[PDB]
Design a protein around this nucleic acid. Sequence first.
RNA 1: AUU
Lengths: 129, 299
Amino acid sequence: STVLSFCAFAVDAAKAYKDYLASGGQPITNCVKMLCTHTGTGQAITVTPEANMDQESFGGASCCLYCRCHIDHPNPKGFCDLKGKYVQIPTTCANDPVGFTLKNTVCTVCGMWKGYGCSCDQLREPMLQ
Amino acid sequence: NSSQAWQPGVAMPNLYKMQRMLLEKCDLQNYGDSATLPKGIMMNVAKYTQLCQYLNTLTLAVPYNMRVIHFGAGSDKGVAPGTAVLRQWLPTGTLLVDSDLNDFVSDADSTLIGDCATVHTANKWDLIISDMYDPKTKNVTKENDSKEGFFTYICGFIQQKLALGGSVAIKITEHSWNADLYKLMGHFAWWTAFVTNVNASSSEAFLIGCNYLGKPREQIDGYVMHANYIFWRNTNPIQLSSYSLFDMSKFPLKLRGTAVMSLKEGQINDMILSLLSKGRLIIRENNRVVISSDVLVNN
RNA sequence: AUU
Ligand SMILES: Nc1ncnc2c1ncn2[C@@H]1O[C@H](CSCC[C@H](N)C(=O)O)[C@@H](O)[C@H]1O
Ligand SMILES: [Cl-]
Ligand SMILES: [Cl-]
Ligand code: NA
Ligand code: NA
Ligand SMILES: [Zn+2]
Ligand SMILES: [Zn+2]
């Protein structure tokens, strides 16, 4: 009742990390990068590494701020969308996988990251034979 | 030699297993040396990738809903690189449980923290992987005798919780070894000591037992077999190589859908032993997988 | 043994 009211105003990992990077703090290290062909689908979160030529595949749990800090996940069930799966991160952002998974969202339609693969908002292509 | 550089690693030739060598120091020509790992890849991701690449060439039983348990899955980094590789290698849906003495973040379905001696399970497993290594072994060395810490637990776990047809990959070193574990290799249809090419500068090897028969097909003296292992490492320098890490196209373990049967001990004739030996049969019940970690209660 |  009053314990959950206090937590929803105090402990906020997402903000504390974004502000920690804003200060200039070193991003979380030891994210587990996997060996893969780099000829995958390029989707955001997958049951197996699916990195394309423009991405790196990492073990999901090692890239989850909540898993890495040993704190509860921000949802009722406490379910993790990364743990047990593989996250594809653009090579240009592979230096901070945790920061990338927090600041971006997965397209519920194509399954690509918003602004890093998802082309659901581009104009309609002329039909091809 | 040369052609070994493109393999994931080197398996102990069978002739070494038939010798009667006296134990002595393991002295590697390239001790300590490091291999060139691909950019941003951890040593244990490379090591487990080569272990799995070699396991792909064996007759592993691979049923649906396969059960794998990984001991010594943690690291000073607080993550589980080996577990991430096992989950990549194993078919999707495979139950993967990992464990370590220290807390860590894992991709396994379940993680148990504490001494492996505190781990219980009423279920049988299809594959047991162990990277356990006692820090005590290194810091303070001593006469190279058989070690009895977590190795006594693994020997017991293999004899009671490994399904017939199941396989194991247990990490050993010059000083981290157990005579009873070598004796148990004689309870598999086949076994070897496998050295990853990325860690060939270390006395480390994985003792691989392929297709558990639940009884000795060969009487093995563990003290002599470890001396044979050291003789092989001392007379066959393995070149450090990361070459096999660059081709991951045939990496995933093929889902063979190996049959699982709950046969009794009185229904294990020579016909069944033959199927277990080719990785065509798993013998255990298929009950709900239940695991636990004992908690020491005190004020 | 966690290059
Ligand atoms: N008795 C015991 N029970 C459980 N874990 C043990 C143990 N003795 C040693 N270990 C564990 O063995 C591990 C060796 S380092 C393991 C590295 C890990 N496989 C990786 O993927 O990087 C250590 O984490 C240590 O905690
Ligand atoms: Cl050498
Ligand atoms: Cl001991
Ligand atoms: Na997989
Ligand atoms: Na090494
Ligand atoms: Zn998480
Ligand atoms: Zn989209």
